[PDB]
Design an enzyme around this catalytic site. Structure first.
Site, PDB file in Angstrom:
ATOM      1  N   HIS A  42      -7.709  -5.573   1.084  1.00  0.00           N
ATOM      2  CA  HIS A  42      -6.465  -4.814   1.053  1.00  0.00           C
ATOM      3  C   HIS A  42      -5.619  -5.047   2.300  1.00  0.00           C
ATOM      4  O   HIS A  42      -6.007  -4.647   3.402  1.00  0.00           O
ATOM      5  CB  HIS A  42      -6.807  -3.329   0.899  1.00  0.00           C
ATOM      6  CG  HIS A  42      -5.623  -2.435   0.705  1.00  0.00           C
ATOM      7  ND1 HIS A  42      -4.918  -2.375  -0.477  1.00  0.00           N
ATOM      8  CD2 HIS A  42      -5.044  -1.536   1.536  1.00  0.00           C
ATOM      9  CE1 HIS A  42      -3.944  -1.490  -0.361  1.00  0.00           C
ATOM     10  NE2 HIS A  42      -4.000  -0.966   0.850  1.00  0.00           N
ATOM     11  N   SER A  64       0.859  -1.190   0.000  1.00  0.00           N
ATOM     12  CA  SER A  64       0.000   0.000   0.000  1.00  0.00           C
ATOM     13  C   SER A  64       0.892   1.235   0.000  1.00  0.00           C
ATOM     14  O   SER A  64       1.721   1.370  -0.917  1.00  0.00           O
ATOM     15  CB  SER A  64      -0.992  -0.093   1.158  1.00  0.00           C
ATOM     16  OG  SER A  64      -2.035   0.854   1.004  1.00  0.00           O
ATOM     17  N   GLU A  92      -9.265  -5.352  -3.652  1.00  0.00           N
ATOM     18  CA  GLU A  92      -8.510  -4.208  -3.147  1.00  0.00           C
ATOM     19  C   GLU A  92      -9.408  -3.187  -2.458  1.00  0.00           C
ATOM     20  O   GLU A  92      -9.045  -2.641  -1.410  1.00  0.00           O
ATOM     21  CB  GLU A  92      -7.745  -3.546  -4.294  1.00  0.00           C
ATOM     22  CG  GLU A  92      -6.536  -4.325  -4.784  1.00  0.00           C
ATOM     23  CD  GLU A  92      -5.355  -4.229  -3.838  1.00  0.00           C
ATOM     24  OE1 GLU A  92      -5.370  -3.350  -2.950  1.00  0.00           O
ATOM     25  OE2 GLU A  92      -4.403  -5.023  -3.992  1.00  0.00           O
TER      26      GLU A  92
HETATM   27  C1  LIG Z   1      -7.144   0.195   8.171  1.00  0.00           C
HETATM   28  N1  LIG Z   1      -6.144  -0.014   7.091  1.00  0.00           N
HETATM   29  C2  LIG Z   1      -5.504  -1.350   7.318  1.00  0.00           C
HETATM   30  C3  LIG Z   1      -4.253  -1.517   6.510  1.00  0.00           C
HETATM   31  C4  LIG Z   1      -4.230  -2.315   5.354  1.00  0.00           C
HETATM   32  C5  LIG Z   1      -3.066  -2.457   4.607  1.00  0.00           C
HETATM   33  C6  LIG Z   1      -1.900  -1.802   4.993  1.00  0.00           C
HETATM   34  C7  LIG Z   1      -1.917  -1.011   6.125  1.00  0.00           C
HETATM   35  C8  LIG Z   1      -3.079  -0.870   6.870  1.00  0.00           C
HETATM   36  C9  LIG Z   1      -6.856   0.138   5.758  1.00  0.00           C
HETATM   37  C10 LIG Z   1      -7.672   1.407   5.646  1.00  0.00           C
HETATM   38  C11 LIG Z   1      -7.071   2.664   5.663  1.00  0.00           C
HETATM   39  C12 LIG Z   1      -7.804   3.848   5.575  1.00  0.00           C
HETATM   40  C13 LIG Z   1      -9.197   3.886   5.469  1.00  0.00           C
HETATM   41  C14 LIG Z   1      -9.984   5.197   5.373  1.00  0.00           C
HETATM   42  O1  LIG Z   1      -9.243   6.354   4.977  1.00  0.00           O
HETATM   43  C15 LIG Z   1      -8.624   7.205   5.892  1.00  0.00           C
HETATM   44  C16 LIG Z   1      -8.638   6.958   7.289  1.00  0.00           C
HETATM   45  C17 LIG Z   1      -8.022   7.823   8.200  1.00  0.00           C
HETATM   46  C18 LIG Z   1      -7.337   8.992   7.812  1.00  0.00           C
HETATM   47  C19 LIG Z   1      -6.668   9.953   8.704  1.00  0.00           C
HETATM   48  C20 LIG Z   1      -6.987  10.018  10.185  1.00  0.00           C
HETATM   49  O2  LIG Z   1      -6.529  11.234  10.726  1.00  0.00           O
HETATM   50  C21 LIG Z   1      -6.120  11.045   8.137  1.00  0.00           C
HETATM   51  C22 LIG Z   1      -6.089  11.201   6.685  1.00  0.00           C
HETATM   52  O3  LIG Z   1      -5.537  12.083   6.063  1.00  0.00           O
HETATM   53  O4  LIG Z   1      -6.726  10.290   5.876  1.00  0.00           O
HETATM   54  C23 LIG Z   1      -7.338   9.212   6.423  1.00  0.00           C
HETATM   55  C24 LIG Z   1      -7.954   8.356   5.489  1.00  0.00           C
HETATM   56  C25 LIG Z   1      -9.793   2.620   5.453  1.00  0.00           C
HETATM   57  C26 LIG Z   1      -9.067   1.428   5.540  1.00  0.00           C
END
Ligand SMILES: CN(Cc1ccccc1)Cc1ccc(COc2ccc3c(CO)cc(=O)oc3c2)cc1
Ligand SMILES: CN(Cc1ccccc1)Cc1ccc(COc2ccc3c(CO)cc(=O)oc3c2)cc1
Ligand SMILES: *[C@@H]1O[C@H](CO)[C@@H](O)[C@H](O)[C@H]1NC(C)=O
Ligand SMILES: *[C@@H]1O[C@H](CO)[C@@H](O)[C@H](O)[C@H]1NC(C)=O
Ligand SMILES: *[C@@H]1O[C@H](CO)[C@@H](O)[C@H](O)[C@H]1NC(C)=O
Ligand SMILES: *[C@@H]1O[C@H](CO)[C@@H](O)[C@H](O)[C@H]1NC(C)=O
Lengths: 537, 535
Positions: free
Chosen positions: B439, B200, B326
């Site tokens: 993802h 990612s 994804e």
């Molecule tokens: C939880 N993450 C798990 C993951 C999967 C693969 C690799 C690393 C982590 C996937 C994910 C990431 C983000 C989202 C939603 O988008 C965001 C969430 C939090 C923020 C934050 C919180 O401050 C700031 C920002 O600029 O953008 C964001 C954008 C959903 C799912």
């Protein structure tokens, strides 16, 4: 009268006729050929709406086909039967508004459902006397009463200065309507049922049928419609008033004519061959599958565009059979797309494909033409010549036929019509065009009329059985509004096309196979996305 | 006292810790400082190399994770908590970790450097999914992972300013790369065989080290899992970076001069910046992050698209790939109708509304173009199709088609490219079945976690993980993922522009497929830019 066949003399509203007893493979049929239904649209009546034929005296001989309406003679492959079979087979004349009637011999005792044929030919050509439209087999094998009429084509049928008195436009369609009225009054004299009248036509004939569906005065002259490989909607079947006015004015200049009345007066002085020699020259762009003089949206015959009418009309009382052939587009590539010939495999390049798309969708902006190219490209083999050749064919066929009828089947079905859809996938063993063209535009007609039943024509036995199946499909639809046979059960059923299930059938040598979606993904591009893209660019 | 747990690097002595892996012990040196703590006046500044230290520095434990947002969507749900920080938050976080076999390797050993993901706003090298003990124990690799600054601390930029030049989070990674060059040989690593791999945002970071020339002398191979430097989310223009930084400063009460603005931001407690991090996006979005690498004209001399289109990648070998679903993970973070507990059967109207969020930059016509492309026009109202297509819009737009574009451009310009699609869903996964393979859930298999019997994976998944560990490490050794001992068909072919071959990674043997969503990615990569342009 006195020593002739008493079963061949009939009276219509205009006088007495003598028909001819014709041989079909399984028995005799009655043929009444060359019946005049209008005053000859000649001289000062050129471009005018047809006038009803004034009654005659004595017995009119109705034993031979009459003149073909004045038109272009195709010279692409001179003497090649693939082209010549469509060319006129009688004398060319503006005096050409005659119709033909086939019935069983002797004529039916009880009122018999009527089929009226409207030929195609891009609104610039065609004739009810061609061998492919021989009604003797449907008349003999199915007991049908078949009527086919000549209508004016090219400039004589469709040159329009919209709003004028002397060239109102659509008179070719008014020629067709006058013949439908003639069937209403007179077909009972032959044993036909005027309360069971089905129109069927192909290409521009199918579009003509669809336009009678959309015009009020025509609706009370028939009860069912078959539209083969043609629709009133779509990019070629109609033109705006402004565009018809420009092509008429330009053609007038090209023949030396430079107020509407003075213009048409001059056009009426020019030889007919002068008009035919220049009709093809007034198209706004180098194009395939577009014709100079076609029905015009006048606010009269067509109160609005076909698209607007099929969106709002009420069609609950209407039963419609529509369909396409497997390769609607291939026939048109040999008439001006570089790289394409009937004498080679027509394996083209990406460059030739991109040039062909500009010709195949000539109204497209650069962005819109791209969108077509990106959709039809095989991105795993974007330069493969066979795919590019086949994609060029599909572009023309989808844009001009397949997606127009897929759209109209869905509209009519949503407005309460009973719709049956087919795809015709059988290539005639007698076909002279090359293999790469597949099943080209117009080559299901000979099977609908049952020509394979003629033993002198070298069709195969299964093609004989096949043609009989289609004849029963078409005549069951005319009889009942339902192509299925009431007696049968074991044979697979032909379900109606619906928006919810989008079912159609394959027509080939195998039993009926039911499929879902009429090129659904690709037609969403043509019917939904591309119109919105064209507004933006 | 254990001599194999004592290593001298150029900054002084370290003591590691012997760890238990299922097949044997491993030497682990965790919490090694590679930079001066970027605190106080060093906030938003490039990293400085860590100064020498006296005595034996204690490298037995994981150091703090860089100050970042703590996800609260499903509080206490393992599916979300597995990505949350598992050490204390601190702006003092520039540390790296090293795993080596025990005993430390005799000959020089190829090095893999992991760069974690987390949308450039989160992540840490200490998560369980990045446990390097299995790769070091089974494949004998020297594994290195580093922390780098995320969010405002890593990427808030006043482009052209001296005090907040941008991309310092990438410079954090690059500094750790220099550290590996200068020191990994002391651990038994081979500084002449260094393979980067990340997922990612980590994959995107890897791709930017490919596209930044000072980074290129620090590694020899790259693996980009589910992320690219090109694409709609991985970078921002300098103008958009200055807008987002300026609005966050106003949101936290900082008001003119670049210097004056940055000074006030340096006086703000870290949580204040994280509190407004997410409120500076120009539109309501999914798969969009507020603070990401910036096209500064320095670290990135041009847009990643311009650089992949014109670069010279002859001496490069790359492994790239995607997971089967994804985009599904991202829908439950703001798309109405989607939920982990629900089956997320959506109406058509919700589908049109969801597409505006998934393609936030799209004009009305470009959104209609996507809607009509992804609709199944035989079942245009079916909610199962509309749900799965929403997940496919986000997945293709943000990962799959950026990957296919990068793979094709690298292959066309000298690079040796291997491509995969990862299709196995972990039997231990706790997300609902409609999300498929979400993802980020290939990572646990590549690091060899199934080989830990206590985590309750299936026995085939163990064999599967070993296969993937061998693909990755054989790629690190050779630039070719194919086992040189194994001499059977099928082999993993290179991805070319002509044949477009990739392989499917599942419990079935490798299967070769041609064209990575070719027709649909033609829409995203070739048509959509022209439409958005002329609209
Ligand atoms: C939880 N993450 C798990 C993951 C999967 C693969 C690799 C690393 C982590 C996937 C994910 C990431 C983000 C989202 C939603 O988008 C965001 C969430 C939090 C923020 C934050 C919180 O401050 C700031 C920002 O600029 O953008 C964001 C954008 C959903 C799912
Ligand atoms: C040959 N024809 C066979 C056929 C198939 C189905 C029904 C009727 C006839 C199909 C066909 C028709 C037209 C073309 C090329 O387009 C033309 C050809 C001639 C004209 C002419 C010639 O004057 C005038 C015009 O306005 O437009 C034209 C447009 C290719 C193939
Ligand atoms: C087919 O023939 C036409 C006319 O001779 C020619 O223009 C075209 O290039 C030919 N195509 C191929 C693939 O040979
Ligand atoms: C049918 O074939 C015969 C000889 O096999 C031939 O003489 C005849 O002309 C053919 N008919 C047609 C219509 O081609
Ligand atoms: C699924 O779940 C969420 C929250 O539980 C709800 O808001 C959403 O409307 C649900 N989806 C549908 C289609 O009802
Ligand atoms: C594996 O399952 C057992 C129960 O069979 C449980 O006690 C153990 O905690 C599980 N391990 C993990 C890592 O969840």
């Amino acid at each position: 009268e006195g020593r002739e066949d008493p079963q061949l003399l009939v009276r219509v509203r205009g006088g007495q006729l003598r028909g001819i007893r014709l041989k079909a493979p399984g028995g005799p049929v009655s043929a009444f050929l060359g019946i005049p239904f209008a005053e000859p649209p000649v001289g000062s009546r050129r471009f005018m709406p047809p006038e009803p034929k004034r009654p005659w005296s004595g017995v009119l001989d109705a034993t031979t086909f009459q003149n073909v309406c004045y038109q272009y003679v195709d010279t692409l492959y001179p003497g090649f039967e693939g082209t010549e079979m469509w060319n006129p087979n009688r004398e060319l004349s503006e005096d050409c508004l005659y119709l033909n009637v086939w019935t069983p011999y002797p004529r039916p005792a009880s009122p018999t459902p009527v089929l009226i044929w409207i030929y195609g030919g891009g609104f610039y050509s065609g004739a009810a006397s061609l061998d492919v439209y021989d009604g003797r087999f449907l008349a003999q094998v199915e007991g049908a009463v078949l009527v086919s009429m000549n209508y004016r084509v090219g400039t004589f049928g469709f040159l329009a200065l919209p709003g004028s008195r002397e060239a109102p436009g659509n008179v070719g369609l008014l020629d067709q309507r006058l013949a439908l009225q003639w069937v209403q009054e007179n077909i009972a004299a032959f044993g036909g049922d005027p309360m069971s009248v089905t129109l069927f036509g192909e290409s521009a004939g199918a579009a003509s049928v669809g336009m009678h569906i959309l015009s009020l005065p025509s609706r009370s002259l028939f009860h069912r419609a078959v539209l083969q490989s043609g629709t009133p909607n779509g990019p070629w079947a109609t033109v705006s008033a402004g565009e018809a006015r420009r092509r008429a004015t330009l053609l007038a200049r090209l023949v030396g004519c430079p107020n509407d009345t003075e213009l048409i007066a001059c056009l009426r002085t020019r030889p007919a061959q002068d008009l035919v020699d220049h009709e093809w020259h007034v198209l706004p762009q180098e194009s395939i599958f577009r014709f100079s003089f076609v029905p015009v949206v006048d606010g009269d015959f067509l109160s609005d565009t076909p698209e607007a009418l099929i969106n709002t009309g009420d069609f609950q009382d209407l039963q419609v059979l529509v369909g396409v052939v497997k390769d609607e587009g291939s026939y048109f590539l040999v008439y001006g797309v570089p790289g394409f010939s009937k004498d080679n495999e027509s394996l083209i390049s990406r460059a030739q494909f991109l040039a062909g798309v500009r010709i195949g969708v000539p109204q497209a902006s650069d962005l819109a033409a791209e969108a077509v190219v990106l959709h039809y490209t095989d991105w795993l083999h974007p330069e493969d010549p066979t795919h590019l050749r086949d994609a060029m064919s599909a572009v023309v066929g989808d844009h001009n036929v397949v997606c127009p009828v897929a759209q109209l089947a869905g509209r009519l079905a949503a407005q309460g019509a009973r719709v049956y859809a087919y795809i015709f996938e059988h290539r005639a063993s007698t076909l002279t065009w090359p293999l790469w063209m597949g099943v080209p535009h117009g080559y299901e007609i000979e099977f609908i009329f049952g020509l394979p039943l003629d033993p002198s024509l070298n069709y195969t036995t299964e093609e004989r059985i096949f043609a009989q199946r289609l004849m029963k499909y078409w005549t069951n639809f005319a009889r009942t509004g339902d192509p299925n046979d009431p007696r049968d059960s074991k044979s697979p059923q032909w379900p109606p096309y619906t928006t919810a299930a989008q079912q159609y059938v394959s027509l080939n040598l195998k039993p009926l196979e039911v499929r879902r979606g009429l090129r659904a993904q690709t037609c969403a591009f043509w019917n939904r996305f591309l119109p919105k893209l064209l507004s933006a660019t």
